[PDB]
Amino acid sequence: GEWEIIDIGPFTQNLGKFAVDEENKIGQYGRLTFNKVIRPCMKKTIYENE
Amino acid sequence: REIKGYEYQLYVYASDKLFRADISEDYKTRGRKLLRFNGPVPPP
């Protein structure tokens, strides 16, 4: 429904370190190390009764 | 209510290559998965 470009701060780089960590474990790309995040970062808001 | 959860679509430089991940996040347990990950893609 709604989307937004959120700031590239600490809560956004946690989302990045987490990503990489979970994929270090799937390693389709091996054993990568997290660098940082660039923009834009986006965020979707999901909703649904039925 | 209505709001289920969220979804982040970052651009992550890791091992000096740009990848693009999508993290799901539950609007209640605030827990999250690593829905997807690709690349390298180019700078946006």
UniProtKB/Swiss-Prot annotation, chain A:
Q: Which UniProt keywords apply?
A: Taste-modifying protein
The job of this chain, per UniProt, is described as: Taste-modifying protein; intensely sweet-tasting protein.
Recount the biotech application: Natural monellin has not been mass marketed to the food industry, primarily due to the challenge of large-scale purification of the protein which is relatively sensitive to heat or acid treatment.
Summarize the subunit comment: Heterodimer of an A chain and a B chain.
Q: What name does UniProt use for this protein?
A: Monellin chain B
Keyword Ligase part of the UniProt annotation: no
Q: Where is this site: Blocking, abolishes the sweet taste?
A: C41
Tell me the superkingdom of the source: Eukaryota
Tell me which species this is from. Answer: Dioscoreophyllum cumminsii (Serendipity berry)
Name the Pfam families on file: Monellin (PF09200)
From Swiss-Prot, chain B:
Q: How is it used?
A: Natural monellin has not been mass marketed to the food industry, primarily due to the challenge of large-scale purification of the protein which is relatively sensitive to heat or acid treatment.
Top-level taxon: Eukaryota
Protein keywords? Taste-modifying protein
Could you give the subunit structure recorded for this chain? Heterodimer of an A chain and a B chain.
Gene3D superfamilies referenced in this protein's UniProt entry, alphabetically:
6.20.50.130
Please give the name of this protein.
Answer: Monellin chain A
Role played: Taste-modifying protein; intensely sweet-tasting protein.
What SUPFAM superfamilies is this protein classified in? Answer: Cystatin/monellin
**UniProt cross-references to InterPro entries, sorted A to Z:** Cystatin_sf, Monellin, Monellin_A, Monellin_A_sf
Give the originating organism. Answer: Dioscoreophyllum cumminsii (Serendipity berry)
